[PDB]
C-alpha cells in the first residue's frame, strides 16, 4: 500500500517485545519501507492459499497471541536483510533489493517453514513438536538464504547439490543468529522445536550425529528419501563449516579454527562465484578452497583450515 512509514510495537513468539516497522494507511500494515523495496508480512488465516492478506492492524500494537508469529517473521526478515547488506554488501536476495514477503498462520498445525521460489511460508506448528516457526531467527534466515541460493548458485534440490543447498541455509541462518546476538549457538531451531524438552534442536552443526545425521562422508545416506537425503547429508557439510570456524579434532584430523567472519566470507564467495546448480561435495571443496585462496592467499592459514576441515569429514 501507499502510506506513511511508522513504527509499532509488539510481542514475539517467545514473549519478547520488539519494535517493528509499519505503514499507516487507515490501518497499520506490516510493511517495512525502510529496507530495499520493502518487507511485507501476510496472514494466510490457516489456509494454504498464498500469500493471504497483507497484515492489517488497527492500533499499531501487536500484542495479541495471533500477532506473535507475524511480529517475528516481520522483524527477523529485517535483521536478515541487514546481515546481508552490512556484511556482504548484498541488496536483498536478488542483489537488487527485491521485496521480501512472508506469510504466517499457514495451514493448520503445520510443522514446517519454507521458501516456495517466491516467498517465505511459516506454519504455526502443532504445539508439541514446534511452536510457530518464525520465532527462531535461524529458521527465518535459513529460509531467506534459500532465496539467495536460488538467485545465485541455483543448487538443484536433490542429492549432493541439494544437501549443499540446505547446509548453506543452516550455515547462514546460524551466522545470522550470531549476528543478532540472539542467544547464539551451532544448533538449528532450538528456539521453536519441542517446547516441552529443553536442550534439543532439530539439527546440530557442531555434532550432527547427536541426532543421527552423518558427520563423515563415509556415513552418507545414499537412498531416496528426503530427496536423496538433502536434510541428512547436509550434516557432513555443516560439520565441515563448524570446524573451519571453531577448530577441533575430528576422526583424528586436526583443524585450526579461523572464526565465523571468515567462514561467512569464504562461503558467500563460493556460493556467489563458484558454485553451479549441479555442484557436488567435491566441487564445493574446490570452490571453498579457491575462495579462500582468492581472499587470503594460497599459502594462507585460511586455505589450510578449509583443506583440513574437508579432509576431516572425508570430502576429497
Ligand atoms: N525443514 C526440515 C525439518 C522440519 C522437520 C519436519 N517438519 C524438513 O523439511 O524436513
Ligand atoms: C524447518 C526449517 C529449518 C527448514 N524448512 C527445515 O529444516
Ligand atoms: Ca540459539
Ligand atoms: Ca540456533
Ligand atoms: Ca525443545
Ligand atoms: Co493491534
Ligand atoms: Co531448507
UniProtKB/Swiss-Prot annotation:
UniProt entry tagged with the keyword Kinase: no
Cofactor note: Binds 4 Ca(2+) ions per subunit.
Residues reported in the UniProt entry to bind Ca(2+) 2: 138, 177, 185, 187, 190
Binding site for Ca(2+) 4: 193-194, 197, 200
One GO term describing the cellular component: extracellular region
Requisite cofactors: Ca(2+); Zn(2+)
GO molecular function: metal ion binding; metalloendopeptidase activity
Superkingdom of origin: Bacteria
Localization of this protein: Secreted
Catalytically driven reaction(s): Preferential cleavage: Xaa-|-Leu > Xaa-|-Phe
Active-site positions on this chain: 143, 231 (proton donor)
Coiled-coil boundaries: none
Keywords: Calcium, Hydrolase, Metal-binding, Metalloprotease, Protease, Secreted, Signal, Zinc, Zymogen
Residues where Zn(2+) binds: 142, 146, 166
EC number: 3.4.24.27
Main location: secreted
Binding-site list for Ca(2+) 3: 177, 183, 185, 190
GO-annotated biological processes: proteolysis
Temperature and activity: Thermostable.
Positions contributing to Ca(2+) 1 binding: 57, 59, 61
Enzyme class, UniProt record, top EC level: hydrolase
Described function: Extracellular zinc metalloprotease.
Record family assignment: Belongs to the peptidase M4 family.
Full protein name: Thermolysin
Species in which this protein is naturally found: Bacillus thermoproteolyticus
Biological classification of the source: Bacteria, Bacillati, Bacillota, Bacilli, Bacillales
Shown part of the complete sequence: 233 to 548 of 548
Amino acid at each position: 500500500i501507499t502510506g506513511t512509514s511508522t513504527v509499532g510495537v509488539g510481542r514475539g513468539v517467545l514473549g519478547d517485545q520488539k519494535n517493528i516497522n509499519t505503514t499507516y494507511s487507515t490501518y497499520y500494515y506490516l510493511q517495512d519501507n525502510t529496507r530495499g523495496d520493502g518487507i511485507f508480512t501476510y496472514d494466510a488465516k490457516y489456509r494454504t492459499t498464498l500469500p493471504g492478506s497483507l497484515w492489517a492492524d488497527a492500533d499499531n500494537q501487536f500484542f495479541a497471541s495471533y500477532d506473535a508469529p507475524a511480529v517475528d517473521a516481520h522483524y527477523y526478515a529485517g535483521v536478515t536483510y541487514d546481515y546481508y547488506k552490512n556484511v556482504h554488501n548484498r541488496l536483498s536476495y536478488d542483489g537488487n533489493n527485491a521485496a521480501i514477503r512472508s506469510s504466517v498462520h499457514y495451514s493448520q498445525g503445520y510443522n514446517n517453514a519454507f521458501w516456495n521460489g517466491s516467498e517465505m511460508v511459516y506454519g504455526d506448528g502443532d504445539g508439541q513438536t514446534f511452536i510457530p516457526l518464525s520465532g527462531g531467527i535461524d529458521v527465518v534466515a535459513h529460509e531467506l538464504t534459500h532465496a539467495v541460493t536460488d538467485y545465485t548458485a541455483g543448487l538443484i534440490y536433490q542429492n549432493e547439490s541439494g544437501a549443499i543447498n540446505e547446509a548453506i541455509s543452516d550455515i547462514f541462518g546460524t551466522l545470522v543468529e550470531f549476528y543478532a546476538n540472539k542467544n547464539p549457538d551451532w544448533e538449528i531451531g532450538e528456539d521453536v522445536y519441542t517446547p516441552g524438552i529443553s536442550g534439543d534442536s532439530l539439527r546440530s552443526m557442531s555434532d550432527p550425529a547427536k541426532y543421527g545425521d552423518p558427520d563423515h562422508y563415509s556415513k552418507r545416506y545414499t537412498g531416496t528419501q528426503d530427496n536423496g537425503g538433502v536434510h541428512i547429508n547436509s550434516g557432513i557439510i555443516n560439520k565441515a563449516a563448524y570446524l573451519i570456524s571453531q577448530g577441533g579434532t575430528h576422526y583424528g584430523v586436526s583443524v585450526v579454527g579461523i572464526g565465523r567472519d571468515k567462514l561467512g566470507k569464504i562461503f558467500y564467495r563460493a556460493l556467489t562465484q563458484y558454485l553451479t546448480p549441479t555442484s557436488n561435495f567435491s566441487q564445493l571443496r574446490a570452490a571453498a578452497v579457491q575462495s579462500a585462496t582468492d581472499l587470503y592467499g594460497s599459502t594462507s592459514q585460511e586455505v589450510a583450515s578449509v583443506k583440513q576441515a574437508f579432509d576431516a569429514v572425508g570430502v576429497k
